[PDB]
Amino acid sequence: ELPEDPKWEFPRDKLTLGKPLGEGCFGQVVMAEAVGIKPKEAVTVAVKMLKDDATEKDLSDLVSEMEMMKMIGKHKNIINLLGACTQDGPLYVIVEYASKGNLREYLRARREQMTFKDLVSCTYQLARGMEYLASQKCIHRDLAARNVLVTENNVMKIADFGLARDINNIDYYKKTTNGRLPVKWMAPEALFDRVYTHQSDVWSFGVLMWEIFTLGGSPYPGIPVEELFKLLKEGHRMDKPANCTNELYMMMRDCWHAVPSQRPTFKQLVEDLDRILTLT
Amino acid sequence: ELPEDPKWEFPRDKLTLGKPLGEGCFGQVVMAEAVGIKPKEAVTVAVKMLKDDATEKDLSDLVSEMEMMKMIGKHKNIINLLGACTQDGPLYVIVEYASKGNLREYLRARREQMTFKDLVSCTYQLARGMEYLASQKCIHRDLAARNVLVTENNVMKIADFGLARDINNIDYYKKTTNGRLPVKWMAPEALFDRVYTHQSDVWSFGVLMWEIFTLGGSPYPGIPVEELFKLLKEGHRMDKPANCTNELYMMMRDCWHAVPSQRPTFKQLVEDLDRILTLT
Amino acid sequence: ELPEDPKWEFPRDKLTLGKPLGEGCFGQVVMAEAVGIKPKEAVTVAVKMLKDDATEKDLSDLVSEMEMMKMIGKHKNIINLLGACTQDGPLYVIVEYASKGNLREYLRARREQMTFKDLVSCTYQLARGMEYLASQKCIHRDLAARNVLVTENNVMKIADFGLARDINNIDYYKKTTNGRLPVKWMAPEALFDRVYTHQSDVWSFGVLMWEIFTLGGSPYPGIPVEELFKLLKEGHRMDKPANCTNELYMMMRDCWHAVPSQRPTFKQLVEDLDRILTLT
Amino acid sequence: ELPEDPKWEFPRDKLTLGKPLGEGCFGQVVMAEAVGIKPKEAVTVAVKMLKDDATEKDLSDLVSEMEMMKMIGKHKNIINLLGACTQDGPLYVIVEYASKGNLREYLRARREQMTFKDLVSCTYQLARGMEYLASQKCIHRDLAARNVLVTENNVMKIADFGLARDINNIDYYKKTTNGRLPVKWMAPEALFDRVYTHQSDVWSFGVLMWEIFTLGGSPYPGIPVEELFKLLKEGHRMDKPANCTNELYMMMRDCWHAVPSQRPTFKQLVEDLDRILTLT
Ligand SMILES: CC(C)(N)c1ccc(-c2nc(Nc3ccc(CCN4CCOCC4)cc3)ncc2Cl)cc1
Ligand SMILES: CC(C)(N)c1ccc(-c2nc(Nc3ccc(CCN4CCOCC4)cc3)ncc2Cl)cc1
């Protein structure tokens, strides 16, 4: 059924599936080996594919993710699309491999020992990735620690574009009902007003920072998602994590302004975060 | 709520609403006069706006239509977006005025007297408009006679982009359930397979030709939409209209091939239709 | 395609279509004559049917309306389902005929002369109809003046159940995104919280009262739907119509309490409205 | 946010969470102990709850499942709803515990040794459960081996009602787009025609039988979900599993008739399956 794309197509015989990296929401990812880089030698990659119980939504999400990674482009703070097996056979999305795993699990481990200087660097990389994304006119809609992978040598890479959208010409004003996004990372306009913008992503980024500075802590601790709907309206916000500069918490609190225009842009988070690193 | 766009914004005091051109599915259009073209004099235009009972879908559709007309661009066989009043007040979408009305009502009238040479010219213009649209990577999804307007001097213009989509980077494979498109103009893959492509639009164009050559006739005469679901699967198609070249009916029948890839592209319909006109 | 229902099926030869009563959102209604009541003589009825450009949504809405009117039952303040032509041919929904037309247009006319005593009676009937509906565990979701018909002798009848739902066992908590309901009649939880209950309908009823006491006035005069989203959050409400008891406006204002549980039930509106009538 | 239900409410202090039984699609289930049966002693139960990354869909699904289990009722071949913690705190759905696990994993294990007589008994129980469900006017929409649990003493229990629907008064004709159902278990009308009936469930049951008689085999072996769309149209079906009576395969093949009305009802599968067991 799927159409063809010559520039991205990759021969099935040059791929050898292996150890399953983990099951997802609309499929699963397994470790693999692919012959084709321009050296033409075996480099380790990750292959996202469907399961037996796949639904049409699962199918459409994975295809969407493949199509998003193509328009986004090449960047070091995001996982790059290497190749894909679409023609005659099961869909395979070939992306780069991240040896350390996901940011959440990574952080919760080292609590060798990790430093504060690292956390600011870690956050800065992510700010850079999101700045680029926003420049490409793409809204992620699912920014979280679990969705950030870390390779060998510790490079921060934003992953999982199954829910991302192309905002180049269309913004989906009053069309995005956002019922499939995790509530604890959603901005108020996303939850109640049927809209999603770059400013909505900065809110989520704010929550991402909290996860980092708590070493993989779960947002709104002790507060179930079901009561968060009214609390968010009341103006409730999370408090400062013991192990965070008073300048950092103000950045978080800034991403959490009820009014979208009053929140900082990703370019701003880049400049300000760059400053703090130099003075660390 | 709506963001701003300087290049397209138009002052409310320079607009004078008037005679209602007709009610639609998600609002209504009225005749107006606007001072701002670069002469700076009063030119007649059409203003699309919401009604009192507007829904959020109605709202989102109209905004979508405005955003689509911006990425599509300037073309003579499509109604151009002139201006828009978004800032502080009711949304107003200012597009050009078509004096004769819609193709369907237009055709059903003259049955002075109209010629066959006209019908081929009429169809050719439409083929040109759709070729351009496809080039801009836009799928209309609602091509029909009622959605084609004709100005003074008889220029064919494709209108109503509330259902159109941007296919530049994303195609919506297995996501488009297409429940809001008129069934008698829908291609089989659109109705059953959760997809919509340029080839799907050629099918609809095929039905548009039938409407033209029957002088505003209603597709599948005597067949209710409710039984069309099974008939379309059986391979049922419409027959040749008495007042149509045997070469024309083959073009229609070609747009109606169950397999999308076996249908002609819009560029082909351009070349072939151009040929027939010269020999008319 | 549609299944069969013996108890409601009505022979096509005993029906004679006629004057079109008006076009709708998902079809149209025309005046007709049907032989079959138990006298077996020609009684005037209204037939709801699809148009040529019908969509699958239009189709599904009309079928839904037919199925809703069956579970709701027999009541004088609601338009009753008389019969239906589903088997072999175009779907026809046969409901009773209302000679005066819709409440909105009706009211805007007489502004012979109508009295205040009438308006309270008119509102009381509607309160009775909605009480019954709520008892049948049905949420209308589209209560408005335009959706209330008035027969000969002036009986108030609630119509148009295409958007109504069955709440008997399922309530659709966080599933109802409500994007197809007119915003000026929607309750805040309906617009922002992805829920709809009987309390949501009382809000709409509150707006219905305003329409009545303004003689077919348009809600939130001078305020476009697009700015109503923020105003509703601010706590903005409509003010008292000159030609309304100070006791009435308090009932309206009571249907408009931000908290659903603080609004009056339909049974309460019945008792209180019954009181005022006796003292009029 | 969630309303209250006295007859089903269960005190949080009388529940002790424990070992996680496994993660799901919209939450997770953990083993627990609850004091309240009418003995008033500690009985093991299973608690379905949300995770930190829960979405509004996840939330709405779990609530839907709780509401479905209430209207369905008490039956031995389905997992019964014991209690629920909704008021003030995280939503907890308390259902009965199944010690052996899910049918799929169960079967794939014993391939002590299991007999053919068992498989017919196993299939018969499931036929009984589904007959009852259909009687209650509920469509499961997700019948599969993975969704059938087996308790101690080997009783077959149908689980996971997050996707189930109430068909009592409404059937959702042309409304059910079914994009969240696993394709390998879907009936053709479900996949292409926007409908779902009891006959659609018999198809899935047909696939369930295949899973049983292959000892937890994966449907359409070697055929990826992506090519199944065209194959299903071509009339392709699965072949007889080596370890299945020629009378059984005919029952499967009967559930797989393209025309819904030509498939057997659940009552029929009950009578016929009951016959074969007696002669085993
Ligand atoms: C979102 C989701 C779930 N679909 C998902 C899951 C995995 C990935 C992913 N993971 C890795 N690399 C990697 C390496 C080690 C481990 C750790 C695995 N773990 C360690 C502990 O023991 C059990 C296995 C995990 C991942 N590389 C690329 C990608 Cl694209 C992306 C999305
Ligand atoms: C799709 C829909 C309905 N929303 C819709 C409706 C109208 C238009 C539209 N119509 C005109 N010009 C025009 C001129 C005359 C008549 C004829 C009007 N008619 C003639 C007979 O007497 C009654 C009025 C009709 C239109 N110009 C621009 C536009 Cl954008 C577009 C879409």
Ligand SMILES: CC(C)(N)c1ccc(-c2nc(Nc3ccc(CCN4CCOCC4)cc3)ncc2Cl)cc1
């Ligand atoms: C919601 C919608 C639009 N689909 C719709 C439209 C019409 C009805 C409806 N209308 C009537 N009776 C009636 C009588 C007179 C007039 C007045 C007609 N009007 C008067 C002025 O001149 C032009 C025609 C209008 C209606 N009876 C039963 C029904 Cl079920 C229901 C819904």
Ligand SMILES: CC(C)(N)c1ccc(-c2nc(Nc3ccc(CCN4CCOCC4)cc3)ncc2Cl)cc1
């Ligand atoms: C659909 C889904 C996933 N959400 C899901 C998951 C679990 C259940 C469920 N499971 C059990 N009992 C049980 C006992 C043992 C094992 C085996 C667990 N397994 C064994 C092998 O080692 C690892 C753990 C599994 C389940 N009881 C009641 C319920 Cl309601 C229902 C749905």
